[PDB]
């Protein structure tokens, strides 16, 4: 009983995640998480009828996908045509006790799944990790502003898309005054989204919602 083996733990030193709409990294495993570990999140499609999604696996602490370490990329396709947001692409990052990162994307509606396996770097990589941590600390402000702009644009894009769906469904029951007001606000929001002014995007989202209440009633009344 005198002899024994030394107990160690593997920890991820940098967040792990995938690229999502807007070129942003979305984290599935937090920095400083002990191995083994398994995390999953559900994602969906960005357009109606989209038949595939790209899963681009990233490691690092920056907000722009391009500024993190690319670990791998694969597609899940054969997604049958559906409205945006209907597919349920569950993406699971599972790192086993051997440091192997297993990435799965499965459409839970259909059971269709694709996978990749990413091996761990053979030690030592202290300088690489340090350089990535430093790079994120130096740019923490700029990255934060990028992330907030992307989030804002994606929210405006969400409001734009579901409001348009509700107009289309409202059809001729939408009075012309309302139709014109909403359509005009849709255009103004669409223009704000091309900007870099978060306040202006939020202002146009609020103006759109303010003129969309008759619409929501009809939408609610089939």
């Amino acid at each position: 009983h005198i002899e024994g083996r030394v107990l160690l733990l593997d920890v991820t030193p940098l967040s792990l995640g995938i690229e999502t709409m807007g070129g942003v990294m979305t984290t599935l495993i937090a920095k400083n998480t002990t191995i083994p570990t398994k995390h999953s999140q559900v994602f969906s499609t960005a357009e109606d009828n989209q038949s595939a999604v790209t899963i681009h696996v990233l490691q690092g602490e920056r907000k722009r996908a391009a500024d993190n370490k690319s670990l791998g990329q694969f597609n899940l396709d054969g997604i049958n045509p559906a409205p945006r947001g209907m597919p349920q692409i569950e993406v699971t990052f599972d790192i086993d006790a051997d440091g192997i990162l297993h990435v799965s994307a499965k459409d839970k509606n259909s059971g269709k799944e694709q996978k990749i396996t990413i091996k761990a770097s053979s030690g030592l990589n202290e300088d690489e990790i340090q350089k990535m941590v430093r790079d994120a600390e130096a740019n923490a402000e700029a990255d934060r502003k990028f992330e907030e702009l992307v989030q804002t644009r994606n929210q405006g894009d969400h409001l734009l898309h579901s409001t348009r769906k509700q107009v289309e469904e409202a059809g001729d029951k939408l009075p012309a005054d309302d139709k014109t007001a909403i359509e005009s606000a849709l255009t103004a929001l669409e223009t704000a989204l091309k900007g870099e002014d978060k306040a202006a995007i939020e202002a146009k989202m609020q103006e759109l919602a303010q003129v969309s209440q008759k619409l929501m009633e009809i939408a609610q009344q089939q």
Partner: peptide, 6 residues
Amino acid sequence: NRLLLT
């Protein structure tokens, strides 16, 4: 659900 592109 965040969104993914092709």
